[PDB]
Every structure is written in structure tokens, then in C-alpha cells.
């Protein structure tokens, strides 16, 4: 049976840093291979024709069936899988690597579906030209996707391949299609990132043109495949009037606490409640918290991690359809304000191993 996001609930994890690369997730990897680049675009440029061999090794080794077993043992029922657009289309001007990403995606998705009946969200984390001027959108400094009909068409070509991957998977009912991640056209000053000010009405109109095109394409092939819309950092309420209630649509909200607020480990449940109570729409469409983590801006403490993770899970499940944590596997050693490093707050496998869900 296909899922109805209005009645489905699940707690999940992101498989971040696996098919798309970021400096913070694995410090050893980045130090060894980036040449100091800020982005996956530059890491691949730095490696030159060794970019593919290095990345294929990481694809084959970072996330294996054993990771899926560990996640299932901790009660995970949803995997969100960020991918670069270059897994789906090979554009000669892109510096992102086009390889066997989807073969590893299929191996891990098949195992999670056939073994555990997990639900899989396929996220095209970047789109051609760049959606937010960050590494995750294509490359640092790239916002060329907006208002560009060539990049629009390439984005639809990418989505035609993701729909086909789902439709021919053997279990189309196991997947949700997420065609954009954190679009932003007003974040030259990063103080507005994570806020409604990251996306202007002009940018939002282009995003809406794209999501409407994706919805029409999915409906033309298989209307039972849900579309997960990551509406930047606008409240879901902002987009509600743009879609009829009959659309097979779920919103993906992202909630973080690690900068730009007076959060602490002590008060983190108050900030999580605020986000759940104020940023979950009116109920017109369902909401899933597709990314979050417990790192606070100030005064991180190690002893409140279990309390904070469990408070977040219960909050997202109470005000929305559940959540997926960023991220499954994280070894980055960037210092946090207070106790420890990012790997102590951002690695979901560590929480499982330390018995937070027993």
C-alpha cells in the first residue's frame, strides 16, 4: 500500500554526507581530499580525475547494510537520502561527479525496504545552477538556478529519472520524491539563513513554478507517489494557499538551533516546542521534520543529549508526522560552544549505541 502522509507517522534519519559531501560531517575525509575547498564542487575540482575513484570508495563504504541494521535496531523506519543532481544527470559544465551513486542508493534502499519495510525519501539536494549559494545547492556562490529556463529544464530531466527510479523499483509504494532542498535567493548575508528572509517573493514564485511542474509530471506517471516540498524556511502556512488540498503533498520543515539564537542544552526543549507549535502549518497539508539536530548555540552539555533527542522526537511526532535526524554517521570534530565537538551531538548511530532508545 502507498502511504498517506496525513496518517503515516515515523521516526527516521538522514543518510547525509554519503552521496553528497560537506566539510563538517567527516573532518578526516575533508582534510585529506578537499584541498581546502568550501564545497563538494571544489573538492571534486581539487581531486581532478581522481574525484570519481575517491567518491566511489566513499559511496561503497560509508553506509552499508550493517548501518541499516543498526538504525533499525534503534527504531528507525524512514530514511531520507540526500543526493546531488549529478547522480541523475551528467552535464558537461558541472564539476560535481556523475558516477554509480544510484546503484548504491538502490542497494541500500532495496535492503531497507525488503528487510525492514522502511519508507525512503529521495531528495535532490542540489539542482543545476545552484539553489542557495551553498555547497548543498550545487556550489558555494551559485544561485544560477533561479529564473533560468535551461536549468529549469535540466531540473525536470533529473526529476524524470527519480520518478523512473521509484516507478521501476519493484516497490514504488516505499518512496517519496523531494525535488528541492532549502532554496534561498536572499542569503548573501547568512544571518537570514534559517529564516523566512532567506527567500524573497520573486524567488518563491520561481520555486512554485518548479514544484507545480513536478506535481504535474508525477500525476501524469503515478499520482500515488507523494511529493515532499521543502519550502525553504518559510512557515508551511506561507505555501498552503498555493495548492489545492487534493494535492498529494507533504511539507518538509528543517529545524536547527546551533546559531543565531539564545538556545542552550538546558532550554532546547522550549525552542523545539516553539518550532513545532508555530511552524507546522494549519493542518491543510501534513508536515515532516526532515532535518533537525540538538546542537545549541550556547552551553552545550553532554548529559542532556538523551533528554534533548527524546524530547525532540516526541514533539515532532505530536505536532507533525515525525522527523528525520541529521545525520546517521558524523565524525566531524569542529568544537561546539560548551562541552565536546560536533560528532558528540550530530551522530545518530552514537545515540543508538549508547542506548538512548532502550
Ligand X SMILES: *[C@@H]1O[C@H](CO)[C@@H](O)[C@H](O)[C@H]1NC(C)=O
Asked if 267 touches a copy of itself (CB under 8 A), the answer is: yes
Closer residue to a copy of itself (CB): 238 or 357: 238
The residue count of the chain comes to 358
Asked if 56 touches ligand X (CB under 6 A), the answer is: yes
Asked if 192 touches a copy of itself (CB under 8 A), the answer is: yes
Closer residue to ligand X (CB): 5 or 193: 193
Residue choice 31, 69, 90, 278 for contact with a copy of itself (CB under 8 A): 278
Residue choice 28, 103, 191, 302 for contact with a copy of itself (CB under 8 A): 191
Instruction: Single out the segment in contact with ligand X by CB under 6 A; choices: 71-79, 192-200, 246-254, 315-323.
Output: 192-200
Instruction: Give, as ranges, the residues between 206 and 245 that touch a copy of itself (CB under 8 A).
Output: 234-235, 237-238
User: Phi/psi of residue 136, each to 5°?
Assistant: -65, -30
Asked if 274 touches a copy of itself (CB under 8 A), the answer is: yes
Asked if 277 touches a copy of itself (CB under 8 A), the answer is: yes
Residue choice 262, 283, 334, 354 for contact with a copy of itself (CB under 8 A): 262
Instruction: Give me the DSSP letters along 123-184.
Output: EE---TT-SSSSGGGTSTT--TTTT-HHHHHHHHHHHHHHHHHHHTSS-GGGEEEE------
Residue choice 52, 172, 196, 340 for contact with a copy of itself (CB under 8 A): 196
Q: Within 10 Å of residue 56's Cβ, how many Cβ atoms?
A: 16
Helices H, strands E: what count in the chain? 12, 8
Pairwise CA distance, residues 87 & 62, whole Å: 17
Residue choice 4, 6, 31, 117 for contact with ligand X (CB under 6 A): 31
| 178 within 8 A of 228, measured Cβ to Cβ | yes
> In the bound complex, what is the minimum distance in angstroms from residue 22's beta carbon to ligand X?
15
Asked if 255 touches a copy of itself (CB under 8 A), the answer is: no
Q: What's the distance, CA 346 to chain centroid?
A: 14
Tell the burial category of 227 from Cβ atoms under 10 Å away from its Cβ (0-12, 13-18, 19+).
Answer: buried
Nearest to 51 by CA among 38, 40, 37, 36: 40
Closer residue to a copy of itself (CB): 74 or 196: 196
Tell the burial category of 104 from Cβ atoms under 10 Å away from its Cβ (0-12, 13-18, 19+).
Answer: buried
Residue choice 7, 49, 168, 189 for contact with ligand X (CB under 6 A): 189
The dihedral of CA 284, 80, 157, 21: what is its sign?
positive
Residue choice 35, 191, 205, 209 for contact with ligand X (CB under 6 A): 191
Q: Which DSSP symbol is given to 341?
A: B
Asked if 192 touches ligand X (CB under 6 A), the answer is: yes
Q: Residue 52 binds which entry of ligand X, a copy of itself, none, with Cβ cut-offs from 5 to 8 Å by kind?
A: ligand X
Q: Within 10 Å of residue 115's Cβ, how many Cβ atoms?
A: 12
Residues that bind ligand X (CB under 6 A): 27-28, 31, 52, 56, 99-100, 103, 129, 144, 148-151, 153, 186, 189, 191-192, 197, 200, 260, 333
Residues that bind a copy of itself (CB under 8 A): 189, 191-192, 196-197, 234-235, 237-238, 260-262, 267, 270, 274, 277-278
Amino acid at each position: 500500500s502507498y502511504i498517506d502522509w496525513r496518517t503515516f507517522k515515523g521516526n527516521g534519519v538522514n543518510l547525509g554526507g554519503w552521496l553528497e559531501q560537506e566539510s563538517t560531517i567527516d573532518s578526516l575525509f575533508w582534510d585529506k581530499y578537499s584541498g581546502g575547498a568550501s564545497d563538494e564542487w571544489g573538492l571534486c575540482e581539487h581531486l581532478g580525475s581522481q574525484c570519481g575513484p575517491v567518491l566511489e570508495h566513499r559511496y561503497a563504504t560509508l553506509i552499508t547494510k550493517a548501518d541499516i541494521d543498526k538504525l533499525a535496531s534503534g527504531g528507525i523506519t524512514v530514511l531520507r537520502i540526500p543526493t546531488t543532481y549529478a547522480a541523475w544527470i551528467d552535464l558537461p559544465s558541472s564539476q560535481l561527479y556523475s558516477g554509480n551513486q544510484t546503484a548504491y542508493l538502490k542497494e541500500i534502499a532495496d535492503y531497507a525496504i525488503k528487510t525492514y519495510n522502511m519508507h525512503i525519501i529521495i531528495d535532490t539536494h542540489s539542482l543545476p545552477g545552484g539553489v542557495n549559494g551553498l555547497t548543498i545547492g550545487e556550489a558555494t556562490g551559485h544561485w544560477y538556478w533561479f529564473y533560468n529556463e535551461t536549468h529549469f529544464n535540466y531540473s525536470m530531466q533529473v526529476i524524470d529519472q527519480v520518478i523512473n527510479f521509484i516507478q521501476t523499483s519493484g516497490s514504488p509504494q516505499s518512496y517519496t520524491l523531494e525535488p528541492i532542498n532549502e532554496p534561498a535567493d536572499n542569503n548573501t548575508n547568512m544571518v537570514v539563513f534559517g529564516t523566512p528572509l532567506a527567500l524573497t517573493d520573486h524567488g518563491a514564485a520561481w520555486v512554485l513554478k518548479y514544484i507545480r511542474a513536478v506535481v504535474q509530471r508525477v500525476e501524469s506517471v503515478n499520482p500515488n507517489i507523494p511529493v515532499m516540498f521543502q519550502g525553504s524556511f518559510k512557515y508551511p502556512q506561507y505555501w498552503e494557499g498555493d495548492f489545492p488540498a487534493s494535492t498529494n503533498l507533504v511539507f518538509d520543515t528543517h529545524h536547527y538551533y546551533y546559531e543565531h539564537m539564545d538556545s542552550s542544552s538546558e532550554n532546547l526543549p522550549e525552542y523545539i516546542l516553539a518550532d513545532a507549535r508555530e511552524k507546522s502549518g494549519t493542518g491543510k497539508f501534513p508536515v515532516f521534520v526532515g532535518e533537525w539536530a540538538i546542537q545549541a548555540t550556547y552551553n552545550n552539555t553532554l548529559a542532556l543529549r538523551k533528554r534533548n533527542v527524546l524530547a525532540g522526537l516526541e514533539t515532532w511526532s505530536s505536532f507533525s508526522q515525525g522527523s528525520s535526524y541529521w545525520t546517521a554517521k558524523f565524525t566531524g570534530n569542529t568544537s561546539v560552544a560548551g562541552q565536546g565537538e560536533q560528532k558528540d551531538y550530530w551522530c545518530y548511530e552514537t545515540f543508538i549505541d549508547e542506548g538512548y532508545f532502550n
